[PDB]
C-alpha cells in the first residue's frame, strides 16, 4: 500500500525505572524521593506506591521475551541513580549495576537496541536532603553518575538520554508539588529548571570526553499551545504558556538563551534565579539528537487570573483519553516541523507517545484495545507526514511497553502495549495493540 516508513526506522517502546522495576529497598538500593513521596499520605491516588510495581527487577527476562514477541527494535528504559549510587555520590552499589548489565545483555542478545535515560525523576533522597536540585552540587553529582555509566556500557549502549521532561520535574515537583519532592515554590522551580539544564550539558561534555561510540540527546515534553478566541489578548496569552513549557527549555538547549519576554517577567515578579557566568554555554553544548514526548495540544484563553500570563487552559469537548488528555493527532505534525524550523537540524525521536484507555481483561486473557490502536495509528500517520516533509524523524517509542505506575495516579491508568495483572501473578498479557504494532513494524506499514 502506502504510508510505508524507512526500512530502518527505529520502532520502539518506552518505560521508566521507578514506574516498573519495584524492589525499592532490595539489594542495597538507596531511597529515592519517589519512595518518599509515595510513602507520604495524601500524595498518590489510592495510596499506591512503586514499592513493587511490575516487579520488573525480577521479571526482566520475561519482559525481554515479551519485547522479542512484539518485535520492537529498540527499548527505551530508565536507569535508577539511587539503585546504582545509593547516596547519589560515593560508593557504587555493585548488585544494582549488575542488574542493568544483565538487562542490556538480554536486550543485545535479542537484537533490541538499548536507549538509556539517565535521569527519569528518581533523584536519590540523600541528595534531596542537601538541596536536591536547588543545590548546584546535584548537577555535578549527576555528571559523575553519568560518567560512571558511560564507562560501564561503553561498547554496549548506543543511544543516551540525559533527562526525561525537565519541565515537569521542575514545575510538577517543586511548583505545584504533586510530584516528588512535593515542594510548592515557583521560585525554587525556576532554579531547579536551571540546574537540570546545567547538569545536562555537563553530562554531554563528559560524554564527548569519554568518546563512546553512540549518540547523546535530551528528552523534552512539548505541548503546542493555541488561542481559544480570536483575541490579541489570547494570542499573547498563549505565546506565554507555550514559551513557559517549550521555548523555556528549547531555547537554552538549542539557542543558548532563555526566552527573554518570559525571562524578564519572571525576574520582574519573582527574583532572579542564581546563574553563574558561562552556564548558558554548558547548557547548549552540541548534542546529536532531540527526543520529544507528545500527548496533546493546549487551548489557551486569556482570563485574569490567579497566575501572571495571565491565562487559563480551556477544557474541550473532541474525544479524550482516560487522563482527560484531548486526543488531537495533527498537533504532533505541527510541533515536529516547528522544532525543525525554529530550533534544530539534528535528528528527531518521538521518545514518548501513547494513551491510557479503560482496558478490560477478557476471561481468556485477551484485551481488545481498539481505541488505543486508533490513537497510535493516528499519531503514527502524522509522524509519517512530518517525515514526508522536512523533518529528520529517526524513531518512535510507544509509551508504554507495559502498564505501570502513573505517578500521582498510581495504577489507575494503563498506558501499556502489555496489560499487567498486578494483583495476580503480576503476569503479563499482550494487548491487541501490541499485536497490531508487531504488524506495523514488520510490514513496515500502518494503514488508512
Ligand atoms: Ni508518563
Automatic annotation (TrEMBL):
Gene3D superfamilies: Glycosidases. The active site is at 165 (proton donor), 352 (nucleophile). It catalyses: Hydrolysis of terminal, non-reducing beta-D-glucosyl residues with release of beta-D-glucose. Its EC number is 3.2.1.21. The keyword Hydrolase applies. Keywords: Carbohydrate metabolism, Cellulose degradation, Glycosidase, Hydrolase, Polysaccharide degradation. It is an enzyme of class 3 (hydrolase). GO terms for cellular component: cytosol. NCBIfam families: BGL. One of its GO terms (biological process) is cellulose catabolic process. It comes from Halothermothrix orenii (strain H 168 / OCM 544 / DSM 9562). This is Beta-glucosidase. It holds the Pfam family Glyco_hydro_1. Substrate binds at residues 19, 120, 164, 295, 399, 406-407. GO terms for molecular function: beta-glucosidase activity. Belongs to the glycosyl hydrolase 1 family.
Amino acid at each position: 500500500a502506502k504510508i510505508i516508513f524507512p526500512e530502518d526506522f527505529i520502532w520502539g517502546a518506552a518505560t521508566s525505572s521507578y514506574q516498573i522495576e519495584g524492589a525499592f529497598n532490595e539489594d542495597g538500593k538507596g531511597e529515592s524521593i519517589w519512595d518518599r513521596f509515595s510513602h507520604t499520605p495524601g500524595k498518590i491516588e489510592n495510596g499506591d506506591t512503586g514499592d513493587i510495581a511490575c516487579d520488573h527487577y525480577h521479571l526482566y527476562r520475561e519482559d525481554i521475551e515479551l519485547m522479542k514477541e512484539i518485535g520492537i527494535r529498540s527499548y527505551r528504559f530508565s536507569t535508577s541513580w539511587p539503585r546504582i549510587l545509593p547516596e547519589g555520590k560515593g560508593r557504587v552499589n555493585q548488585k544494582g549495576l549488575d542488574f542493568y548489565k544483565r538487562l542490556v545483555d538480554n536486550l543485545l542478545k535479542a537484537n533490541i537496541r538499548p536507549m538509556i535515560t539517565l535521569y527519569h525523576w528518581d533523584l536519590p533522597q540523600a541528595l534531596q536532603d542537601k538541596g536536591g536540585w536547588t543545590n548546584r552540587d546535584t548537577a555535578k553529582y549527576f555528571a559523575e553518575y553519568a560518567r560512571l555509566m558511560f564507562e560501564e556500557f561503553n561498547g554496549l549502549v548506543d543511544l543516551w538520554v540525559t533527562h526525561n521532561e525537565p519541565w515537569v520535574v521542575a514545575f510538577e515537583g517543586h511548583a505545584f508539588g504533586n510530584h516528588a519532592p512535593g515542594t510548592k515554590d515557583f521560585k525554587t522551580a525556576l532554579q531547579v529548571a536551571h540546574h537540570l539544564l546545567l547538569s545536562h550539558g555537563m553530562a554531554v561534555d563528559i560524554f564527548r570526553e569519554e568518546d563512546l561510540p553512540g549518540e547523546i540527546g535530551i528528552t523534552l515534553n512539548l505541548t503546542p499551545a493555541y488561542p481559544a478566541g480570536d483575541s490579541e489578548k489570547d494570542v499573547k496569552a498563549a505565546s506565554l504558556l507555550d514559551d513557559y513549557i517549550n521555548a523555556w527549555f528549547l531555547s537554552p538547549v538549542f539557542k543558548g538563551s532563555y526566552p527573554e519576554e518570559l525571562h524578564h517577567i519572571y525576574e520582574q515578579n519573582l527574583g532572579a534565579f542564581t546563574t553563574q557566568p558561562g552556564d548558558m554555554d554548558i547548557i547548549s553544548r552540541d548534542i546529536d539528537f532531540l527526543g520529544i514526548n507528545y500527548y496533546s495540544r493546549m487551548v489557551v484563553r486569556h482570563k485574569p487570573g490567579d497566575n501572571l500570563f495571565n491565562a487559563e487552559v480551556v477544557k474541550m469537548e473532541r474525544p479524550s483519553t482516560e487522563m482527560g488528555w484531548e486526543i488531537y493527532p495533527q498537533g504532533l505534525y505541527d510541533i515536529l516541523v516547528r522544532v525543525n524550523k525554529e530550533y534544530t537540524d539534528k535528528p528527531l525521536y518521538i521518545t514518548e507517545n501513547g494513551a491510557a484507555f479503560d482496558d478490560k481483561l477478557t476471561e481468556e486473557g485477551k484485551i481488545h484495545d481498539e481505541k488505543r490502536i486508533n490513537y497510535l495509528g493516528d499519531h503514527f500517520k502524522q509522524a509519517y507526514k512530518a517525515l514526508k516533509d522536512g523533518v529528520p524523524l529517526r524513531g518512535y517509542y510507544v509509551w508504554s511497553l507495559m502498564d505501570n505506575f502513573e505517578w500521582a495516579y498510581g495504577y489507575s491508568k494503563r498506558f501499556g502495549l502489555i496489560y499487567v495483572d498486578y494483583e495476580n501473578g503480576n503476569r503479563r498479557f499482550l494487548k491487541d495493540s501490541a499485536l497490531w504494532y508487531r504488524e506495523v513494524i514488520e510490514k513496515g506499514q500502518v494503514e488508512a
